[PDB]
């Protein structure tokens, strides 16, 4: 509940990358 | 009736496969490291790999 403002961008990118998906 | 008719390829035990293909694996690493992927040798290796994958579908 106290996440840093200077790393908001990097948390967003990790959330997008670490999602399930089908290969090709 | 002749060698060609009765010739068969033996099946390599799973535990011995890292020794039967050691030379071929080294060569592919040798070619890509020194000549690059935009090379005539690299293209030949890729074509042979396509043949092996295609035969898996039986």
């Amino acid at each position: 509940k106290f996440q840093s403002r200077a790393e908001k961008k990097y948390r967003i990118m990790d959330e997008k990358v670490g999602k399930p998906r089908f290969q090709a | 009736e002749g060698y060609v008719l009765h010739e068969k390829k033996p099946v390599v035990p799973r535990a011995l496969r890292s020794f039967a293909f050691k030379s071929q694996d080294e060569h592919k690493s040798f070619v890509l490291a020194r000549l690059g992927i935009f090379s005539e040798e690299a293209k030949k290796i890729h074509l042979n790999e396509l043949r092996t994958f295609a035969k898996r579908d039986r």
Partner: protein, 188 residues
């Protein structure tokens, strides 16, 4: 509109035509390496439905609870079983079954004859962590991930299991239990 086939298959009879290989290259070495791998995969699983689901936030043992129920069953039966199981993993298995069937139809297979012929899991990349314990000791805190692969084939050997089906509760104007005549039960 299938991807090109660049070599003969291993089937007894050939069903497609081999096409000449491309003569152009990709601009970068990284792009060229990635595309060669994609071409290799396109030579496989022809005349069958396949799916490959990556980075499921579950473990091998949790996924095997559901997968062991659907092996060697007809597609219709397997799909129904995955719906009724109240497990978080059952949701991912259901998505894979639908994705694979859509793949089979694009290849020109009849969905009414599909059978689940192969299913297995594969290890993903793990998120490592640590949790403290008593008296200064420490332990592991790991989040696991797994890959799921499903293959559907036509007229493959299948199990005879079949489930009975009943209708749900009738609610609305379609329910007519209030028209029952209870005067008959007073007679002999």
């Amino acid at each position: 509109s299938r991807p090109p086939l660049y070599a003969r298959s291993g089937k007894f009879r050939e069903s497609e035509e081999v096409q000449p290989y491309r003569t152009w290259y990709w601009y970068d070495a990284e792009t060229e390496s990635e595309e060669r791998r994609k071409e290799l995969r396109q030579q496989l699983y022809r005349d069958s439905g396949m799916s490959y689901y990556l980075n499921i936030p579950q473990s091998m043992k949790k996924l095997e609870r559901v997968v062991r129920v659907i092996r060697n069953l007809a597609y219709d039966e397997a799909w129904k079983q995955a719906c009724v199981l109240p497990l978080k993993a059952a949701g991912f298995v259901k998505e894979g079954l639908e994705h694979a069937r859509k793949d089979a139809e694009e290849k020109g297979l009849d969905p009414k004859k599909l059978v689940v012929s192969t299913v297995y899991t594969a290890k993903g990349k793990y998120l490592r962590g640590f949790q403290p314990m008593g008296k200064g000791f420490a332990g592991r805190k790991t989040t696991r991930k797994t890959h799921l692969r499903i293959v559907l084939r036509e007229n493959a050997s299948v199990l005879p299991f079949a489930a009975q089906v009943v209708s749900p509760s009738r609610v609305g104007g379609a329910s007519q239990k209030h028209l029952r005549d209870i005067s008959v039960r007073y007679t002999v």
